[PDB]
């Protein structure tokens, strides 16, 4: 229901964002999306390039 990094609005928009501690504690707003699935998938790509090998994403790719 709630994706880690995706904020849902009471209108129909979402927002994919990730927390990066390596950047001295700075935010990384990927961008708003149309649904929680699109904003959640975009969060996985930024949480895999920034974290590198293996990472905890809303959609833990493994197939």
From Swiss-Prot:
<feature type="DNA-binding region" description="AP2/ERF">
    <location>
        <begin position="2"/>
        <end position="60"/>
    </location>
</feature>
<comment type="similarity">
    <text>Belongs to the AP2/ERF transcription factor family. ERF subfamily.</text>
</comment>
<protein>
    <recommendedName>
        <fullName>Ethylene-responsive transcription factor 1A</fullName>
    </recommendedName>
</protein>
<comment type="function">
    <text>Acts as a transcriptional activator. Binds to the GCC-box pathogenesis-related promoter element. Involved in the regulation of gene expression by stress factors and by components of stress signal transduction pathways.</text>
</comment>
């Amino acid at each position: 229901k709630h994706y880690r990094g995706v904020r849902q609005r009471p209108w129909g928009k979402f927002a994919a964002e990730i927390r990066d501690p390596a950047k001295n504690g700075a935010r990384v707003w990927l961008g708003t999306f149309e649904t929680a699935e699109d904003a959640a998938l975009a969060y996985d790509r930024a949480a895999f390039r920034m974290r590198g090998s293996r990472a905890l994403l809303n959609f833990p790719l493994r197939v």
